[PDB]
């Protein structure tokens, strides 16, 4: 299947409480493998997955230097955006950055990303062609004009199509036992009487990896969305994921309903029916 590597940076200003908080995490697919926290004691990039711990001191030194450089630039970015938006020094504000790359089942480059948000809304984002920018508003046009005149996108194209792909491949190989595994969901259905009139059917998918999954209800073989509820896919805490979907049905008609489970670890989609 396809894979991705992504880094997520969160920078939060703390007026009167010293330097801004800075947190960086790195993911391969749905597995976190590194973190950095400006408030932690070590002041180093740290491992968060077993397979990355085999990297030697030059790796950790290099990643620590780069993540501190990212932190220094975000410190200034907060002050820069406060000016663009004519905001006071009194309030707390949040800058987010995400970048990384997707590859196909042949592990060749598919898509690259490099984008920013300010206080929860888009600020600027590299477009899919890796040559141009989407400025979310008038303030972000300033950044876009600067980045265009400096050909910033061309240097990022090289990282997203080169280093990012190459090291995603290296991680996928070094972590093959866990990153290349496909844990199919374990499934079951529960039934609860809400009254003497209607019943809730709940279709469960447990201990699956990766997170991507589709649970759908059908009645008489036709897709059914009315009277259904679907929760967000959620982490089990052991590296796997969980999800459920429910439908409320008239009592005596449970046998008309089927839950359908699609996941990359299934050789064929599953169809569950009550009892």
């Amino acid at each position: 299947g396809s894979h991705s590597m992504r880094y997520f940076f969160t920078s939060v200003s703390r007026p009167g409480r010293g330097e801004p908080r800075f947190i960086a995490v790195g993911y391969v697919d749905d597995t976190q493998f590194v973190r950095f926290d400006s408030d932690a004691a070590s002041q180093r990039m740290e491992p968060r997955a077993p397979w990355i711990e085999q990297e030697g001191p030059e790796y950790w030194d290099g990643e620590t230097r780069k993540v501190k450089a990212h932190s220094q630039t975000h410190r200034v970015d907060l002050g820069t955006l406060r000016g663009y938006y004519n905001q006071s020094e009194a309030g707390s504000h949040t800058v987010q950055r995400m970048y990384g790359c997707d590859v196909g089942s042949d592990w060749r480059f598919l898509r690259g990303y490099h984008q920013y948000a300010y206080d929860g809304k888009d600020y600027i984002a590299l477009k899919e062609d890796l040559r141009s920018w989407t400025a979310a508003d008038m303030a972000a046009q300033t950044t876009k004009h600067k980045w265009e005149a400096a050909h910033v996108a061309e240097q990022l194209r090289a990282y997203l199509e080169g280093t990012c792909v190459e090291w995603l491949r290296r991680y996928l190989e070094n972590g093959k036992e866990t990153l290349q595994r496909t844990d199919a969901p374990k499934t079951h259905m529960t039934h609860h009487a809400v009254s003497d009139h209607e019943a809730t059917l709940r279709c469960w998918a447990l201990s699956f990896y990766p997170a991507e999954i589709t649970l759908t209800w059908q009645r008489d073989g036709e897709d059914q969305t009315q009277d259904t509820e679907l929760v967000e896919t959620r982490p089990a805490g052991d590296g796997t994921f969980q999800k459920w979907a429910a439908v409320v049905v008239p009592s005596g008609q449970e046998q008309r309903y089927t839950c359908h489970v699609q996941h990359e670890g299934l050789p064929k989609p599953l169809t569950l029916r009550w009892e």
């Binding site: 947190i23 976190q32 987010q96 929860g120 809304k121 959620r234 805490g237 052991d238």
Partner: protein
Amino acid sequence: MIQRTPKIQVYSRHPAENGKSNFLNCYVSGFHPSDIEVDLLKNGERIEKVEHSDLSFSKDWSFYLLYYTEFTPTEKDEYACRVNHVTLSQPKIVKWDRDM
């Protein structure tokens, strides 16, 4: 400034079985900004041995965190997740429902 209120799910790592050691999870997601207070409760009281994941966020920029603790469920003990965030006028408590 986009504010988004947390979605909250409370659940165990493995199917719950009375007397069997397990993990209690409180997953908070879809919220903005990132400052958030999350406690796990046993019969209304705050559990102290609670860990949480590193702050991360989704495609729409909203944050998510997993808080978790080891526990051994029984028949009569009640567990819950208490969450405070700037979008809430008061802390929100979500009880653990094993019977789902």
